[PDB]
Every structure is written in structure tokens, then in C-alpha cells.
Design a protein around this ligand. Structure first.
Ligand SMILES: [Cl-]
Ligand SMILES: [K+]
Ligand SMILES: [Mg+2]
Ligand SMILES: [Mg+2]
Ligand SMILES: [Mg+2]
Ligand SMILES: [Mg+2]
Ligand SMILES: [Mg+2]
Ligand SMILES: [Mg+2]
Ligand SMILES: [Mg+2]
Ligand SMILES: [Mg+2]
Ligand SMILES: [Mg+2]
Ligand SMILES: [Mg+2]
Ligand SMILES: [Mg+2]
Ligand SMILES: [Mg+2]
Ligand SMILES: [Mg+2]
Ligand SMILES: [Mg+2]
Ligand code: NA
Ligand code: NA
Ligand code: NA
Ligand code: NA
Ligand code: NA
Ligand code: NA
Ligand code: NA
Ligand code: NA
Ligand code: NA
Ligand code: NA
Ligand code: NA
Ligand code: NA
Ligand code: NA
Ligand code: NA
Lengths: 49, 119, 49, 81
RNA sequence: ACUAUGCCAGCUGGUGGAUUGCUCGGCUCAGGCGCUGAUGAAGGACGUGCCAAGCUGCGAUAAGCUGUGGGGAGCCGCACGGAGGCGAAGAACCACAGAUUUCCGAAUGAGAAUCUCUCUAACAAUUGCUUCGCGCAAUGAGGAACCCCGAGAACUGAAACAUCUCAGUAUCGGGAGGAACAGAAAACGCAACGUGAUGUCGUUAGUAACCGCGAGUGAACGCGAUACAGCCCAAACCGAAGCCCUCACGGGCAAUGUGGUGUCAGGGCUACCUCUCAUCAGCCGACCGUCUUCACGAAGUCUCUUGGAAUAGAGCGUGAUACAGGGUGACAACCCCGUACUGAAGACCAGUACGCUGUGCGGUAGUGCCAGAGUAGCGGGGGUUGGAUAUCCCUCGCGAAUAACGCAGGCAUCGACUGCGAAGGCUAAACACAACCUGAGACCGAUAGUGAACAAGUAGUGUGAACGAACGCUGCAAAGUACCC
């Protein structure tokens, strides 16, 4: 397909949202924060684009 | 509120400037007589005596005050970690009594001596 | 002053009821979660004009 | 109210463009055109801009590849900042 | 004495997460308060941190900038890390006010799935005024329900079913406000020598009335309360004496009538008598009360015993206009927050009441000068209602009178009697809801209670409309296990 610039920004963001919770955030929180629940796989999941 | 859930909430959720009142400790008889106050906001630099718990009877200077956890560190009141390091055993201020005051700040001293104000 | 009333009651031989009522029961059950933790005996009714 | 140049884009590919091609790489505002990039780069670094190539990337930013004239030396300009 | 594969019951250790205990969440009641938006809201998108994935905050000045007040020796959100910084030049934090506030969005120059295009140019569209120029303005969209105006079912009940019922309900269209709507009688009709705007609550009463007279349906006047408030035009008679914009000049409106008078206590006119009271337009402008926030705030942290820890037991003391509730290493009025008392502020009551300025009320006699028409009323066809020959409304047709007249008093006509003046208009207060603030509880207590105590409208499902979980608890203190194999 052919993406627009806005679509491109949105896809970019979804990729950024796929990061892990940083190691240092787990230390800062005494492990109260571990999993990223919005974790998305390209195959198994589906975006809104 | 008379309701216990509300009372605890308002204590845990109190904004920073309302937490000073959670770090207060009773004054020694002498200091009570001197400033006409039953207790004070504990400052780092005050000297304090431990009235309750494993450390009761010990005296020492106050090294740290944490408003968020409503807790103080007192010199030499410590626990030994597994590696041998010495770390503070944090204390609730209501287990503690202030023997000496750090008066180095004009504002605090003024409030202490005021009849109509409380430090 | 409350203490004045104490002295008077002591003089009237009646103060022991206040002593009876000075103790609180921490109640069995979940009322404490609603603010109903405590109760105490009833002692003296004072009727004025 | 937005600035044109966000920051130099520093990666190995950027270094090769700097060393071999006399080009500098920037993260720039995605609202900026090639001309605006050329101008801003000239004003900030006191150089002469020959050519600008642009890309909207998958990081959500615009990347500009700015080739400098022979009177200017990219590695020298980059070493200042 | 042997016996495996096995059976039943225990024991030790698992698995599992019930139970008990706990509550940062719910549920429900109550008091207060209540509109936002073209000066671009609500909502959304995308950004924004030293490192930053989520949430929160914020907007290219981006977990923030400024001022005043409060607050105070700490702080750098949730979030306990590494580094580093800020704060006595008074930071953090709180209140009020201001600054900044990307893109989409009613979305408004035009187009577009949050981007783009151009004559740096646009209130698009509809509309009022209009210097006829988008020059000055208006509308649009949102909001938890509440409110008003329209459109309007069916399951169901009648033990079938058609009128009836469910029900003017669900749902749909339009629209207002902090409340709305109603409202100063062409009323009532305990018929009176009586009541006196409207809403609401209690009653009248399951009464009158409707109805295959089946099932069902179902008021009102009055009374007791709450709160109270009464007014302005049109016209007669006057006839430019007037209004709007602009600092001003000047412009616009207005004889198809601006303005004065006047409004059943009928008014006007003529001639009198009398008053400065009513009304209306203005100015000032609160107390108290209520809701919320805040300041100050008494008295043990003594002895022995137990315990890791006294908030336990025993002993000795103390305050109390404070023995509500909470926290603190276990049952705490006296350890800490608070609580009683007293005091301060803001908000609502309210631009209200009181006060004041201006205006001038009213009476007699005379006068057929004025007083709202497709109306009142009648007929045809429907809807609606308890409204029955006597509800309210729509539609087609017909159709008056002029106060010396007209309408009503639950069939029609005529007379009498009593009430009242339609076809112009405004109107405070008492009442509805619950977004928002706060308070409360013989409510639930993590399969309960919200779908949601946790990433909750999250994860996830569906092309979409829409659907939609589960997951709470180390410990007094991380002392969160160094060193060695
Ligand atoms: Cl009556
Ligand atoms: K009205
Ligand atoms: Mg990657
Ligand atoms: Mg003082
Ligand atoms: Mg039980
Ligand atoms: Mg290209
Ligand atoms: Mg547009
Ligand atoms: Mg049936
Ligand atoms: Mg039926
Ligand atoms: Mg039948
Ligand atoms: Mg009905
Ligand atoms: Mg009636
Ligand atoms: Mg007039
Ligand atoms: Mg009907
Ligand atoms: Mg649940
Ligand atoms: Mg399907
Ligand atoms: Na996919
Ligand atoms: Na960047
Ligand atoms: Na409100
Ligand atoms: Na983050
Ligand atoms: Na803002
Ligand atoms: Na406009
Ligand atoms: Na115009
Ligand atoms: Na039936
Ligand atoms: Na049937
Ligand atoms: Na019927
Ligand atoms: Na304590
Ligand atoms: Na008709
Ligand atoms: Na009548
Ligand atoms: Na659970």
C-alpha cells in the first residue's frame, strides 16, 4: 500500500510504544512496574491502520 | 470525617506542604517550657531521642527527613545489610523526642517564639 | 470545667459509674471498616433546663 | 514558534556522508522544506549549502542530508558542536 | 517373613487459592453548588522527561513560565534506580490571578482518515445593523440527568383477539436554562352576602368520569401547606416632542408613526375636586444563615513484668466546652494528625432585602371617543383525554357582535341570575436533576460491591454498529540474602 505522512507518524508511534519497560524503571518502582500491556506483535496483533 | 477510609486517604494523599504535620515530634520538658509548644516539625540538624522500639534510649542528630514517606533518619540508628554496609533504620516521628533544635533559620525560630504560630 | 463535675459526682458517691463507662470495647466484626470500631457502656444522664 | 533544526543525526552512515561526501545530517522539523533547511544550516554554522535531501522517517521525525560546498569541510563543522 | 499392579485412612512435602482477618474501590442517602463554546469549547491526535514504555500533567515557554498571598527546609508526579541538579536570591507544595497553549475537532478560505493547497488571503453558511466594506454583531457545538416543543411502536395484559391495555412508555426529530415550563381570570361555581395569578407537596380519591360497561383506565373544584408580586402594550387623545451608531463631526431609523398618554381600580376627552401614596424607570447595596476551606488548640510517652516491638498486664499519675475518627512495630482522650471552644477567608443567598432619586395615586359629573377576526361560534373528518350530548388539539369548509357588546357557570335554544373580558406581551420565590464540592451508612468486602479496589472501558473480539475480562496483602525495618562450593 501507500502510506500518508500522518499514517506514517501513527505507525512510527505504535513502534515506539513497543518498547520494554526500561530496566531502571523496575528498580525505581521496586518491581511494582514490570510488564508492558500494550506490547504488540506485527503478525499476532492488528493495528488500527 | 469520622470514616476511617477517608481519614487514611487524606493522610496518604496529602500534598507536600500538608505533610510537615506528619513529621512532628514531642518536645522535651525544657523546650516545651521555653517555646510554649508541645511538639515541633522535626528538622534535619535537630537532636532527638528515641522513646519507642528496638532503638529506644538512643540519642542522635537527625540526618534526613522524608516528607513523602513521613519518616526520619537519625545518626547511628541503623541496620547492617548482608554485605556489611550500614543503612538507616527509618523512624516514625511519634516515637521520638526533640532534645536540641537547629535554630539556624530566622523563619523557624520566629515561628517557634510566636505566641500565635506553631513550628 | 469537667473536673468540677467529677468532684461533685465523687461527693455524691455516684462517680463509680463514670469509672464503669471508662473503657472501650473494640467490637468483633466488620463494623470497624465502616467507622464502627468502638463502643462503651452508657453511664450518667444529666438533665438540665 | 518551532525551530527548523532539532539536532545533528549522528550515526555511522552519517559519518561516512561526513567524511566522504562533505554532507551533514540533521533531525529537522517535519514542517520544514529543503530551502528552510538550507537556510537554517547556513545561518547557524556559517557555511554554504549546495544540496538538501529529505526523508520523513519511521521515528516520526524528518531527516535532512545537507551537502556542503567545497569551501566548507563537514568534519570540521561537526567537530565544533 | 514374602505381594507386584492395587484399595481405604492418615503423616511429610507439593499443587490449588477456599477460609479468616484487612480495605486505596464500590453502592446508596443527604446538604451545597451548577452552565461551557467562533476571545475556537467539549472531545480526539501527536508531541513533551538526562535516561521514559504506561498513567498523570503540560503544549515547541510543553511533569512546566510569571505575579500576589499562604507554606516551609527541603525538593526534582505516580516511581523506593543510576547520574546529576534545584532550594535562605525562601525552592517543593497550596490558593487566586496572569503567560504560553502544536494539529484535528461546531471547525468557518479550500480540500484531506489529524495532512495539504494559495492571491499571506479568507466570520464557510444563514442572518440583523449597515459608512453597503464582513465595517459592527448573531447562530452553529458540548454537558450527568433534569426541562420544553414535535414524531411515536411492539412484545405484554384482556388467560384467544380487533376497541381497550402495555403507553403518549421505548425509541427518533428540534431546542433552553441553572433550573425549565407556568403565571395575574373572557378563572372558580363547597351557588355564595363566597374564593381570588402560577407551580409544587399533602389530601380530596381509586371519588366523579371513561370502558367488547370486559379487563382495565382515572381527574378536578375545595381544603391543609410551601412560597408569594405584580405589571407592560395595541387603540382612543397627542403628532416628531423620539431612537440607534460615533469622542466629535457626521451618518442611519422614523408620518406604513419614533416618542407622550394608557391598560377593569377601564381608559381617553370636557368640567371639576384632591393627592405626591400606588405603579414604573433608575442609584446604592448588605446583615444573618448555609456550604466549603483555614488558623489556634489541653493532658504521661513514668515504674515493674511479657514481647522483636507496649498501643498488653500490674502500679502511679494527668486533661476534658476536647472520651468523634485516624496514624504510630499489639486494646492509645494524655506519642503524632486531629477532636471541643474561639477566630479568619471564599462561595451561594444577591445586584436580592432595606435605603434613596425621579414619576405621580385617586374621586365626581358629562360623553354610544377607544379597547387585539378567519377570531367567538357552527358543520365535515381525525387524534387525544377521566371528560362522559359536558377534555384538549389538528385538518377541510363556513362564520359574528362591538361594552347599549361579548364569553363562562359540565346537553341545545330563549329569558333571568352570578362570574368574567378571549383572539397582544412580560414576570421574582417555593418544586426537577446530580455533572461538580462535601458529609453520611443495622449497605458490599476482591467469584461480593461498579464492567472497572490492579494497565479498566485496559488486554482482547468484530468490516462496522458494538462487545469486553481477569489480576488486591513480604516485612517493625529491605535488614530484598555478602562470601564460598
Ligand atoms: Cl371557593
Ligand atoms: K415566563
Ligand atoms: Mg526497533
Ligand atoms: Mg510558637
Ligand atoms: Mg466474622
Ligand atoms: Mg522524497
Ligand atoms: Mg477546514
Ligand atoms: Mg392476550
Ligand atoms: Mg394485543
Ligand atoms: Mg374477555
Ligand atoms: Mg391512559
Ligand atoms: Mg373543577
Ligand atoms: Mg408607555
Ligand atoms: Mg387513547
Ligand atoms: Mg469484580
Ligand atoms: Mg459479523
Ligand atoms: Na498484522
Ligand atoms: Na530526535
Ligand atoms: Na456545582
Ligand atoms: Na514514561
Ligand atoms: Na491550557
Ligand atoms: Na461569527
Ligand atoms: Na459585510
Ligand atoms: Na393470555
Ligand atoms: Na396468541
Ligand atoms: Na374499550
Ligand atoms: Na508512636
Ligand atoms: Na373541527
Ligand atoms: Na364561570
Ligand atoms: Na479477586
Amino acid at each position: 500500500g501507500k502510506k500518508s505522512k500522518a499514517t506514517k507518524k501513527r505507525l512510527a508511534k505504535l513502534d515506539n510504544q513497543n518498547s520494554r519497560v526500561p530496566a531502571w524503571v523496575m528498580l525505581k518502582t521496586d518491581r511494582e512496574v514490570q510488564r508492558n500491556h500494550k506490547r504488540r506483535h506485527w503478525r499476532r496483533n492488528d493495528t488500527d491502520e | 470525617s469520622k470514616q476511617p477510609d477517608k481519614q487514611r486517604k487524606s493522610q496518604r494523599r496529602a500534598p507536600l506542604h500538608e505533610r510537615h504535620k506528619q513529621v512532628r515530634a514531642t518536645l522535651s520538658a525544657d523546650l516545651r517550657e521555653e517555646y510554649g509548644q508541645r511538639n515541633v516539625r522535626v528538622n534535619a540538624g535537630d537532636t532527638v531521642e528515641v522513646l519507642r522500639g528496638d532503638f529506644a534510649g538512643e540519642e542522635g542528630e537527625v540526618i534526613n527527613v522524608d516528607l513523602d514517606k513521613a519518616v526520619i533518619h537519625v545518626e547511628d540508628v541503623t541496620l547492617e545489610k548482608t554485605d556489611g554496609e550500614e543503612v538507616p533504620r527509618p523512624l516514625d516521628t511519634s516515637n521520638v523526642r526533640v532534645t536540641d533544635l537547629d535554630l539556624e533559620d530566622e523563619k523557624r525560630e520566629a515561628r517557634l517564639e510566636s505566641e500565635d504560630d506553631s513550628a | 470545667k469537667t473536673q468540677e463535675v467529677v468532684s461533685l459526682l465523687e461527693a455524691l458517691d455516684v462517680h463509680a459509674d463514670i469509672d464503669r463507662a471508662d473503657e472501650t470495647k473494640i467490637k468483633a466484626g466488620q463494623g470497624s471498616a465502616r467507622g464502627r470500631k468502638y463502643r462503651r457502656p452508657a453511664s450518667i444522664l444529666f438533665v438540665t433546663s | 514558534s518551532w525551530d527548523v533544526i532539532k539536532h545533528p543525526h549522528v550515526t555511522e552512515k552519517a559519518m561516512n556522508d561526513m567524511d566522504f561526501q562533505n554532507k551533514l545530517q540533521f533531525a529537522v522539523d517535519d514542517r520544514a522544506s529543503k530551502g528552510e533547511v538550507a537556510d537554517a544550516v547556513e545561518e547557524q554554522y556559517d557555511v554554504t549549502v549546495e544540496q538538501v535531501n529529505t526523508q520523513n522517517t519511521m521515528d516520526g521525525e524528518k531527516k535532512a542530508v545537507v551537502r556542503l560546498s567545497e569551501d566548507d569541510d563537514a568534519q570540521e563543522v561537526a567537530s565544533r558542536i
